[PDB]
Amino acid sequence: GQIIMPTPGKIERADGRLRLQGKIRMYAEESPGSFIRLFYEKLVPESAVEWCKEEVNSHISWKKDVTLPTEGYRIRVTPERIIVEAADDAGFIYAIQSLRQWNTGEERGLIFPCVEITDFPRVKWRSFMLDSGRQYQKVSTIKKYIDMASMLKMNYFHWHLTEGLGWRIEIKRYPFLTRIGAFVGQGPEQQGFYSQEEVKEIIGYAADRGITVVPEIDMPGHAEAALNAYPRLGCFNVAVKVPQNIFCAGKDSTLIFLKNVLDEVCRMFPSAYIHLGGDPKGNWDKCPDCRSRIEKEKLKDSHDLQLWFSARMADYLKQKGRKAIFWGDVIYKDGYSLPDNVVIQWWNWRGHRDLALKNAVRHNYPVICGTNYYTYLNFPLTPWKGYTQARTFDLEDVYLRNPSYRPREENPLILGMSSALWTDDGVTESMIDRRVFPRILALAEQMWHSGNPENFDEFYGKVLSKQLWFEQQGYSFGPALKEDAGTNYKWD
């Protein structure tokens, strides 16, 4: 119709349009099972689809083109038919997302202006993270943001499931982690967890729309809720206040406990990547078990202990065939060397600029670019509670000055970009969209669109032109420019 966001790599308009109303005949070269549920949900109900044996009689065909890049697709709309080609199922899903936006919506059914679109992602890692540790969001809300990620052609949903204020991932072997740990928070929407059944539902929902769900199980820090469940995981069988105390690396029982947890996490989450956090040595510096461990392993200090600990967990993931992601803090200082399945998520630009990026390259660790400036969508456009002027930014900042956007080819160690919505300071479900939109559109554009010229005025014009369509999909917009926010914008 008008435009597709994020911007496709190549769009060539042709004369005419194709109207599809009534029973729609379709042909697929291979079993369409993996992408077809999304098509039925977003474009044409299964009741209106007739599957054809002969392609020539179909209105839409779904064909493999092995010459396309991974996740790439081609769409040709002619006055007679649509031919959709992809190298893999991800490509078909992204083609479907483009068809959703290409439909004019002028009438009932579908109307597609004739076109050839050829499209593929700039970077291999394109993620959105939601903080479900500090706040609980209902399952339908988790689905909403997975659906958003797919809509914007991302491929990973990073699910931050454990925090001092909430352990929300059910572990059958240790029932107290959720039965106690998911109810330690006392504020609005801070109670609840995701059962293994709900996780199975979420994984299936995500798979239907090309999203891999990357769980984050934080260790050794952010353990307060877990320690409420199992105080013996700490240095001593002692009680622990939950802040509106970390896992003891010195106890083999703690490592064994955490390995048992990862056993279940790996059964539930087929993701090749598991995030272990790794970002407070108060308890360690005095623990007989942590100081003993430093001795036995020939470590330097408390920090080196955290590296050793991170190394043991990553090695465990390695023998399970998974990669381990850690926040970049881990490698600010050299020390005990991390195994070759480690990935680094670079985040603290404001405090440390590109330190983590630089140390990750020195050590040959792949990197995800997720810097707070300007991928942390929890930073409002104007000050709010714990966010002062220093932790605010707008659509111009993210589009024009994002340290995480690096369009120059570069080291293949750089995997891509992340975006995040942390729920610090009581961000309830009703408060999420006004932070996420429209700035996530600039992040999605940087992740997907080729590094071709597109100035802010053109990009912002597209945002405004597509806004009501995005709202009709259920996504409310917050202010785009600092000026839009005025003097007393309501962030709560």
Closer CB to Zn ion, 250 or 366, in the complex? 250
Closer CB to Zn ion, 253 or 430, in the complex? 253
- Residue length of the chain: 492
In the bound complex, what is the minimum distance in angstroms from residue 188's beta carbon to Zn ion? Answer: 34
State yes or no: residue 258 binds Zn ion (CB under 5 A): no
Closer CB to Zn ion, 62 or 336, in the complex? 336
Q: How many CA atoms lie within 13 A of 261 on its CB side?
A: 29
Q: Which stretch binds Zn ion (CB under 5 A): 108-116, 233-241, 356-364, 429-437?
A: 233-241
Q: How would you class 135 by CB atoms within 10 Å of its CB: exposed for 0-12, middle for 13-18, buried for 19 or more? A: buried
In the bound complex, what is the minimum distance in angstroms from residue 252's beta carbon to Zn ion? Answer: 11
From candidates 6, 185, 250, 478, binder to Zn ion by CB under 5 A: 250
Q: How far apart are CA 236 and CA 233, in angstroms?
A: 8
Q: Which stretch binds Zn ion (CB under 5 A): 247-255, 317-325, 376-384, 442-450?
A: 247-255
State yes or no: residue 287 binds Zn ion (CB under 5 A): yes
Closer CB to Zn ion, 41 or 301, in the complex? 301
Q: How far apart are CA 349 and CA 372, in angstroms?
A: 6
From candidates 41, 289, 304, 396, binder to Zn ion by CB under 5 A: 289
In the bound complex, what is the minimum distance in angstroms from residue 308's beta carbon to Zn ion? Answer: 12
Closer CB to Zn ion, 106 or 252, in the complex? 252
Closer CB to Zn ion, 171 or 287, in the complex? 287
State yes or no: residue 123 binds Zn ion (CB under 5 A): no
State yes or no: residue 301 binds Zn ion (CB under 5 A): no
Closer CB to Zn ion, 83 or 287, in the complex? 287
From candidates 235, 360, 398, 432, binder to Zn ion by CB under 5 A: 235
In the bound complex, what is the minimum distance in angstroms from residue 160's beta carbon to Zn ion? Answer: 24
Closer CB to Zn ion, 289 or 297, in the complex? 289
What phi and psi values does residue 102 have, to the nearest 5 degrees? -85, -25
Q: How far apart are CA 169 and CA 178, in angstroms?
A: 7
Q: Which stretch binds Zn ion (CB under 5 A): 25-33, 131-139, 248-256, 437-445?
A: 248-256
CA distance to 87, 136, 334, per residue, from 369 (Å): 26, 26, 20
From candidates 248, 294, 325, 480, binder to Zn ion by CB under 5 A: 248
Q: What are the residues whose beta carbons fall under 8 Å from the beta carbon of 230, sequence distance 6 or more?
A: 174, 176, 177, 257
State yes or no: residue 367 binds Zn ion (CB under 5 A): no
Q: Which of residues 47-66 bind Zn ion (CB under 5 A)?
A: none
For Cα atoms 193, 164, 140, give the angle at the middle one, nearest 5 degrees.
30
Q: Which of residues 377-406 bind Zn ion (CB under 5 A)?
A: none
Closer CB to Zn ion, 252 or 340, in the complex? 252
Q: Which stretch binds Zn ion (CB under 5 A): 286-294, 322-330, 406-414, 428-436?
A: 286-294
Closest-CA residue to 160 (of 243, 217, 221, 227)? 217
From candidates 4, 82, 240, 290, binder to Zn ion by CB under 5 A: 290
What phi and psi values does residue 482 have, to the nearest 5 degrees? -55, -35
State yes or no: residue 357 binds Zn ion (CB under 5 A): no
Q: Which stretch binds Zn ion (CB under 5 A): 49-57, 198-206, 249-257, 394-402?
A: 249-257
Binding residues: 235, 248, 287, 290
Closest-CA residue to 44 (of 26, 18, 71)? 26
Q: Which residue has the tokens 């490698």?
A: 331
Q: Which region holds residue 131: left if phi is over 0, alpha if psi is between -120 and 50, else beta?
A: beta
Q: Which stretch binds Zn ion (CB under 5 A): 65-73, 175-183, 242-250, 258-266?
A: 242-250
In the bound complex, what is the minimum distance in angstroms from residue 302's beta carbon to Zn ion? Answer: 10
Size, binding site for Zn ion by CB under 5 A: 6
Gyration radius of the chain's alpha carbons: 24
State yes or no: residue 444 binds Zn ion (CB under 5 A): no
Closer CB to Zn ion, 102 or 284, in the complex? 284
Q: Which of residues 302-321 bind Zn ion (CB under 5 A)?
A: none
Q: Which stretch binds Zn ion (CB under 5 A): 206-214, 235-243, 264-272, 452-460?
A: 235-243
Binding residues for Zn(2+): 235, 248, 287, 290
CB 158 within 8 A of CB 125: no
Residue type, 383: P
CA distance to 9, 89, 389, per residue, from 292 (Å): 57, 51, 44
CB 19 within 8 A of CB 110: yes
In the bound complex, what is the minimum distance in angstroms from residue 249's beta carbon to Zn ion? Answer: 6
Contact footprint for Zn ion (CB under 5 A): 235, 248, 250, 287, 289-290
